[PDB]
């Protein structure tokens, strides 16, 4: 008895390599004054929450805080050019503000496609046919601060701004919010999306197919309301996340043997 | 209590409506090439969706005004006794637009009609758009079109399914139909009544992405790979078990 090469409706990505793989986290809390972007209080909670959840899933987690665009590009290029032959997959998280096709580093915008492009095909051969998962918590920073240089739990509400695009074969692009909706971040507890993502990872990450888990996150986040007492006008500003999948098989994070 | 395996309730009187807008020819002023093979797609889709219990309504080569009128009429009837709604576009496209016979239409205008406040009877129900649309170029022949349509999501409980993502190429056989539609329909026929729908779509991703582009009859087409994608804002598991 063996499996002939017949089309299998339940085929899974092989997750039995020596290592789960690397999870990069790019955490941005502050920005160069010329960008006129507001601070992102609560993002450190997001970063720490994600670090614990992904590490429990077997990932080697590397966090970088407030990198300049050049440092960011350099660092992610370094990861893309080493061998991932002994890894199951790759995860990259961006926690920042964004606009259109761009995510902000500390000092400048970076095009998402340039970031994901580094892991396409034979640019990164050892990840070909392996899941490449980008998680993006990035929206429009409320620009009611000045173009000059400069502990209550507040919920900040940001309009969706980042195009929720896919990235190539075996890429999964996960977005905190879709166009027409609003992203929420609590200044102490962190972002709604990341909080809910992390809760689901801890509870179900080790058995549930990952896109099914993401769907749970869609439901959880979309069901959140702000206590209407708090101002100003977050009433009716619903958040619905989304994911764009070009995965070709089922993705599980069963505990590694 | 929060249920990790919660399914959309698919036990209504009717599965729901599946609209298909099929575009084979375009007004001369648009200077767009014909889409031979698209009628095979239409028939294939009609069969698979009707087998799933859908009430299928097909429309060929509608002008933009007629198309808008039809989709608005559908958005304004009651879906209270329906499980869900499906809308398929077979045409050329560009950016946020799909072409009708005589003009472009914004996808957001199309999907917006079925959003909560516009179509109260579809609230909390799956709204699935399937889009076979790419850039029209300037015996079974394979036509190859560059991806052109932005692969965007559409709101709560919408699922947006695209034949091709940016940087890849969409293929259509003049007799057999589009690669994407063929593979989707094959999966619908084999697994549509049991498999969770996004899981089925993932199979389609695999099938289409595995079609070889090494040895084309047209040497122009070599290396022009096709990978589809889907953008999900579904909030529950979607099945089409027999009603
Ligand atoms: C890749 C890309 N370039 C430009 C745009 C411009 C847009 N308006 C858009 O919605 N999307 C998704 C885009 N996506």
Curated annotation (Swiss-Prot), chain B:
Notes on how activity is controlled: During activation, the N-terminal disordered prodomain is removed by cleavage. Concomitantly, double cleavage gives rise to a large 18-kDa and a small 11-kDa subunit. The two large and two small subunits then assemble to form the active CASP6 complex. Can be cleaved and activated by different caspases, depending on the context. Cleaved and activated by caspase-8 (CASP8) and subsequently by caspase-3 (CASP3).
GO MF annotations in UniProt: cysteine-type endopeptidase activity; cysteine-type peptidase activity; identical protein binding
Post-translational modification: Phosphorylated by NUAK1; phosphorylation inhibits self-activation. Phosphorylation at Ser-209 by AMP-activated protein kinase (PRKAA1 or PRKAA2) inhibits autocleavage, preventing caspase activation, thereby preventing hepatocyte apoptosis. Palmitoylation by ZDHHC17 blocks dimerization and subsequent activation, leading to inhibit the cysteine protease activity.
A GO biological process held by the record: cellular response to staurosporine
UniProt keyword annotations, A-Z: Apoptosis, Autocatalytic cleavage, Cytoplasm, Hydrolase, Lipoprotein, Nucleus, Palmitate, Phosphoprotein, Protease, Thiol protease, Zymogen
Residues of the active site: 92, 134
Residues found modified as Phosphoserine: 50, 209
Impact noted for substituting residue 106 to Q: Increased stability
InterPro entries hit by this protein: Caspase-like_dom_sf, Caspase_cys_AS, Caspase_his_AS, Pept_C14, Pept_C14_caspase, Pept_C14_p10, Pept_C14_p20, Pept_C14A
Reactions that this protein is recorded to catalyse: Strict requirement for Asp at position P1 and has a preferred cleavage sequence of Val-Glu-His-Asp-|-
Residue ranges, annotated region (Tri-arginine exosite): 13-15
One Gene Ontology cellular component annotation held by this UniProt entry: nucleus
EC numbers, comma separated: 3.4.22.59
Known partners and oligomeric status: Heterotetramer that consists of two anti-parallel arranged heterodimers, each one formed by a 18 kDa (p18) and a 11 kDa (p11) subunits. Interacts with BIRC6/bruce. Interacts with RIPK3.
Function: Cysteine protease that plays essential roles in programmed cell death, axonal degeneration, development and innate immunity. Acts as a non-canonical executioner caspase during apoptosis: localizes in the nucleus and cleaves the nuclear structural protein NUMA1 and lamin A/LMNA thereby inducing nuclear shrinkage and fragmentation. Lamin-A/LMNA cleavage is required for chromatin condensation and nuclear disassembly during apoptotic execution.
Family to which the UniProt record says this protein belongs: Belongs to the peptidase C14A family.
Protein name, as recorded: Caspase-6
Species whose genome carries this gene: Homo sapiens (Human)
């Amino acid at each position: 008895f063996y499996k002939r090469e017949m089309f299998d409706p339940a085929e899974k990505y092989k997750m039995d390599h020596r290592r789960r793989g690397i999870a990069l986290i790019f955490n941005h809390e502050r920005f160069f004054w010329h960008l006129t972007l507001p601070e992102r209080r609560g993002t450190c909670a997001d970063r720490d929450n994600l670090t614990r959840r992904f590490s429990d899933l077997g990932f080697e987690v590397k966090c970088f805080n407030d990198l300049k665009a050049e440092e960011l590009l350099l660092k992610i290029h370094e990861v893309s050019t080493v061998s991932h032959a002994d890894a199951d997959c790759f995860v990259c998280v961006f926690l920042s503000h964004g606009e259109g096709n761009h995510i902000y580093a500390y000092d400048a915008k970076i095009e998402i496609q340039t970031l994901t492009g580094l892991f396409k095909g034979d640019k990164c051969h050892s990840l070909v046919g392996k899941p490449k998962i980008f998680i993006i918590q990035a929206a429009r920073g409320n620009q009611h601060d000045v173009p000059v240089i400069p502990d209550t739990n507040i919920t900040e509400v940001d309009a969706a701004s980042v195009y929720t695009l896919p990235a190539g074969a075996d890429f999964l692009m996960c977005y905190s919010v879709a166009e027409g909706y609003y992203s929420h971040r609590e200044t102490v507890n962190g972002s709604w999306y990341i909080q809910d993502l992390c809760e689901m990872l801890g509870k179900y990450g080790s058995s549930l197919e990952f896109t099914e888990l993401l769907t749970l996150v869609n439901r959880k986040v979309s069901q959140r309301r702000v206590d209407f007492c708090k101002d100003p006008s977050a009433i009716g500003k619903k958040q619905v996340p989304c994911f764009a999948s070009m995965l070709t098989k089922k993705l599980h994070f069963f505990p590694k043997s």
